[PDB]
Amino acid sequence: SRRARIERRTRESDIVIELDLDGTGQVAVDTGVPFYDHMLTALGSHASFDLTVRATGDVEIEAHHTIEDTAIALGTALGQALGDKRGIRRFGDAFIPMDETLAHAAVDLSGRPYCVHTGEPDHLQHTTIAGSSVPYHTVINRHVFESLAANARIALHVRVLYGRDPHHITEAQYKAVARALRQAVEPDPRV
Amino acid sequence: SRRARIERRTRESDIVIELDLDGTGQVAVDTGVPFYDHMLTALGSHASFDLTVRATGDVEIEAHHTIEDTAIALGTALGQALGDKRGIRRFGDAFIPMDETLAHAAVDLSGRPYCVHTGEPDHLQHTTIAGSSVPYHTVINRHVFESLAANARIALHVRVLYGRDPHHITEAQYKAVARALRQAVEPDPRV
Amino acid sequence: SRRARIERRTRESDIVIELDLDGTGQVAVDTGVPFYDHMLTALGSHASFDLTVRATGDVEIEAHHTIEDTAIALGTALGQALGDKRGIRRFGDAFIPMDETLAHAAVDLSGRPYCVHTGEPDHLQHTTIAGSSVPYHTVINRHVFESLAANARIALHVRVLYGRDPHHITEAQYKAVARALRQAVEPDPRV
Amino acid sequence: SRRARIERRTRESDIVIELDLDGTGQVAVDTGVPFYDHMLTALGSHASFDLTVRATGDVEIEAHHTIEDTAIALGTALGQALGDKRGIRRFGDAFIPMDETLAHAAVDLSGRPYCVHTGEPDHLQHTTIAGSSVPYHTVINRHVFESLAANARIALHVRVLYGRDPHHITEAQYKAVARALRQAVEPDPRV
Amino acid sequence: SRRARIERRTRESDIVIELDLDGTGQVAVDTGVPFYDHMLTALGSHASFDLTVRATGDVEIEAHHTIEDTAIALGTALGQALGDKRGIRRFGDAFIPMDETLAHAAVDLSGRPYCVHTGEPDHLQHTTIAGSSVPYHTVINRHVFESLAANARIALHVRVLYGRDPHHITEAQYKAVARALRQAVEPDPRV
Amino acid sequence: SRRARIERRTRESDIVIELDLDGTGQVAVDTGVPFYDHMLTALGSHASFDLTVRATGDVEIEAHHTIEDTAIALGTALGQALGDKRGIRRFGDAFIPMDETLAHAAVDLSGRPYCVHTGEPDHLQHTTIAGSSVPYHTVINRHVFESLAANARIALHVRVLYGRDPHHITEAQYKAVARALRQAVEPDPRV
Ligand SMILES: O=P(O)(O)OC[C@@H](O)[C@@H](O)c1cnc[nH]1
Ligand SMILES: O=P(O)(O)OC[C@@H](O)[C@@H](O)c1cnc[nH]1
Ligand SMILES: O=P(O)(O)OC[C@@H](O)[C@@H](O)c1cnc[nH]1
Ligand SMILES: O=P(O)(O)OC[C@@H](O)[C@@H](O)c1cnc[nH]1
Ligand SMILES: O=P(O)(O)OC[C@@H](O)[C@@H](O)c1cnc[nH]1
Ligand SMILES: O=P(O)(O)OC[C@@H](O)[C@@H](O)c1cnc[nH]1
Ligand SMILES: [Mn+2]
Ligand SMILES: [Mn+2]
Ligand SMILES: [Mn+2]
Ligand SMILES: [Mn+2]
Ligand SMILES: [Mn+2]
Ligand SMILES: [Mn+2]
Ligand SMILES: [Mn+2]
Ligand SMILES: [Mn+2]
Numbered sequence A, B, C, D, E, F: 001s002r003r004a005r006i007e008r009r010t011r012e013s014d015i016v017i018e019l020d021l022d023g024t025g026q027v028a029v030d031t032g033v034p035f036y037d038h039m040l041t042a043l044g045s046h047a048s049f050d051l052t053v054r055a056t057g058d059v060e061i062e063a064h065h066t067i068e069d070t071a072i073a074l075g076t077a078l079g080q081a082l083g084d085k086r087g088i089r090r091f092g093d094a095f096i097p098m099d100e101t102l103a104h105a106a107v108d109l110s111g112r113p114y115c116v117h118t119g120e121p122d123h124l125q126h127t128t129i130a131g132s133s134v135p136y137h138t139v140i141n142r143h144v145f146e147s148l149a150a151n152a153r154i155a156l157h158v159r160v161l162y163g164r165d166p167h168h169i170t171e172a173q174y175k176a177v178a179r180a181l182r183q184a185v186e187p188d189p190r191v
């Protein structure tokens, strides 16, 4: 009903997105960038989407291109699956506490494409989250939310009220966008 | 059931308000102040009210008196239609992104009359929104929310988190009050 | 179903808590600290809990010990009654206007124990709310929210956006925690 | 062996102190000032003294005189019970965390009478801890430590590294003095 | 006598902790995060615990989850092994110089769960300690001490008085917690 | 058992040190610099060393050379007497109140040579302590602690928390190093 399959094949990467807005958190994400996988799994789960994301890109250079193309593809999927947007809440927002962190997101689904990202501590502009694989530079967080908003054609405002740990600060934001989405996407029993 | 008809006839103006709290956004507003009409149409629509507003006043002087009397009348209608206020959510709030702007409103419907309006950029104290008709001075925004809160006898807190365009800044606030209202006015399945 | 009875007997005090998460605001609180009684009655009521709190302690010293033990016991009750936490909203938040005051609370019920309390004016660190009985020092507000979060094992973020009156500032916070709780505790029709 | 009984009868008050340095925390304190009782019970207990304090004074005026005379008497008892001070550690110190508070105390038992009290937040100069009885003004904390040091004829340095709650800030200090005392008073197996 | 075995199996990780408070520094730690292994080996050794820690987690994402779960499990073990806490010193503290660094830790074992971490230079919020394996982001230090304190249900105050090298700054803190623990955990010959 | 005899013959001075770590404060110090004698007598006594120091140098120039050579020799003695350092506490620290002054010292005996000296008031960089004999310039305090740490091959951190009198400020530091030493040097019943 509200589903979309998006294939995005660029020089730098290969993306397949399968999205059902009216899901139960059946989410599977593999991008070659494990922390990104973790963030997108949280987003799909907490938005109660069913979501598959398969992506392979030029991670030898760094995660940037793959992360960006994936977000673009995902935003495109979101718009398509939304369709005419009639009968929905339209607006949604959510606060996410995560230990010391508090993040917030608000959305207007029928609003024009726009992203405002504020409150993220300055050290996240040069912070790396690294494991045994391809690392994630948190400076990309903004890029993701902008790409997503621009291709879903929605208004997305993401705020960090405060926080210290970069993992918490980032996950809380992704989760906040997710629940904001979940709320806004739901059928509105009055309109 | 939760309806009210208010007629307010002063030296400066003539107002008729017809309000149904449990509506579907059937809204018709004509005050002689087209931007005000636009704001009140948004308020009624996004609050899921059914709302008629017919007003004629001394617009040769400026919109102030008509805008004020209308808000007073509308607040009075809101209180009357609310009645004993039993069984309702009581509290409501809403975030409204509008391009670069983010506005918020929170309400307590059984709280004592009170309005706090904060965060609006200083240039809105002397900004005019002008078209082919009677203009709207944004400095009035505050006046409207205060008049509304005082006559509905509710607690109304309106915030602009940030914003640049005066049209966006104002509409986002009106819309925020609307959805806050809509939430608070709804029947609460537990109380 | 989601109920708990907690008895907490220390050197300083004696506490009995009876808690039903799925209640209708049937609340009875007696701690020897009337303003605390007032705050906890508001918390239980606005959270739509059914709640009994009977407590006797060393109020000759001051309210601190009794207030603290009670909050610990109450948090313990909340955790127990929550049980495995499956099927619930998990996240909740609420804004509470109270005349000039605006307070907010956000919760993550499956999050790790954590409390962040911010925005409370400095004069509440040495303010007393006094009547004909045992007085309440508002500096304790923080202590209460921390104790509650630590023993329910949840993430609790409480904010005062602004305010002047200490009674309003405190009640608005207690009420905000209550509605945040109420939301987060509710069954989620999708998970 | 290291015991002392002190009776101090002034215009303002009546004090009896019974002190055994080599005790097990058998402590009983009654001054008419319940919070003071609580602080002195903690001091005796954590210092592993056996301690009886019976005091009646002019509490209609306020606790000051009684609190002061008691501390003087207690310091006098400490000196007497110490006697020639041979064979002891002489020096002692202790850190006391108490939730958000951290306090410290260091002592030189054979040093000349001296007290330095630092780091206590400014609002404790006008803070009251009040219950159902005679209240305790925290501004007195300093007075107590000075009186104690002057009459035991020792060097006593009390610090608050940080803290917020006045009950915690005060109790942590009393407890810190207690454990510092306990350490310094102990027989030194080398001297 | 004072031992505990804790198994903690989450989505993100698998932890087994074996803890004897009354040990001789027989410590074996393997978490997949070699620097963490180094820190926990120092903690167990300097606390004179006997300690086994076996942990496997989602280090492809980064060390965070594994580090956190391990600390939670370890804190839980500490509490269990502590049992009723009767007859012990209760309080402990230790200074650790490490070349240019000076760190301190103080504990109250019967105090309520609480952690205050202060004095760590700002560049440790975005510093990485990297070798041939999974890296360690020092921003996590705080997270570890908080998790540990919350699950052992103790008061833990960790301070860096000063320091420059992140390895020294971190190890000195872990070692300080260890010796503070060791002291506080010991049988008290007077209580 | 843990003893050392050091003879240090330079152009500027002649030093003989006899050191027993496991002593009873049998101390005799003669350097031609009476205040230095006083400081070293305090150090040996409060460290419970047995210590003989005989030194003659070029005091016509000033005390510097003799004070320095003596400290070097003493540090060398400390290291030698320490030997393999097995079975000892390793870490030690001590607070020394002295009227208005509070000083602290912490040591790591198996740590690499390092000295950090902080908190000493600026006027001690040009202060003289003078009597009927060769004077002592307090600026040398630092030099002494550095020389001592470098030749004993230990980590020595000396702090003045506060103080006014240069005699007190200096003696408190020497005494603090002494008790820190005494603690760290003692046999550890667990390692
Ligand atoms: O909190 P959640 O259960 O949604 O997620 C698991 C959580 O343990 C993990 O994502 C995380 C916790 N702290 C940083 N990352
Ligand atoms: O965004 P809405 O569809 O609620 O409203 C129409 C919108 O295009 C218009 O009100 C507006 C857009 N920017 C300023 N004003
Ligand atoms: O506002 P409520 O009806 O939830 O509560 C009664 C209210 O009148 C009282 O609690 C109060 C009003 N101002 C300070 N305290
Ligand atoms: O922490 P202790 O057990 O020494 O003391 C009891 C404690 O619960 C009480 O004195 C207190 C706790 N917070 C303020 N006062
Ligand atoms: O100082 P210890 O012997 O406890 O630890 C060995 C030490 O050489 C090593 O842990 C280290 C030294 N500097 C940074 N790390
Ligand atoms: O305080 P002690 O007994 O360790 O030392 C004697 C003391 O009287 C003397 O060293 C001194 C006192 N004030 C400055 N110097
Ligand atoms: Mn890009
Ligand atoms: Mn907000
Ligand atoms: Mn995570
Ligand atoms: Mn007007
Ligand atoms: Mn418009
Ligand atoms: Mn407390
Ligand atoms: Mn009230
Ligand atoms: Mn006095």
Ligand SMILES: [Mn+2]
Pocket: C065, D038, D167, D171
């Ligand atoms: Mn207390």
Ligand SMILES: [Mn+2]
Pocket: A099, A168, E064, E068, E143
């Ligand atoms: Mn975490």
Ligand SMILES: [Mn+2]
Pocket: none
């Ligand atoms: Mn210190």
Ligand SMILES: [Mn+2]
Pocket: E038, E167, E171
């Ligand atoms: Mn190391």
Ligand SMILES: [Mn+2]
Pocket: F064, F068, F143
């Ligand atoms: Mn030199």
Ligand SMILES: [Mn+2]
Pocket: F038, F167, F171
């Ligand atoms: Mn002297």
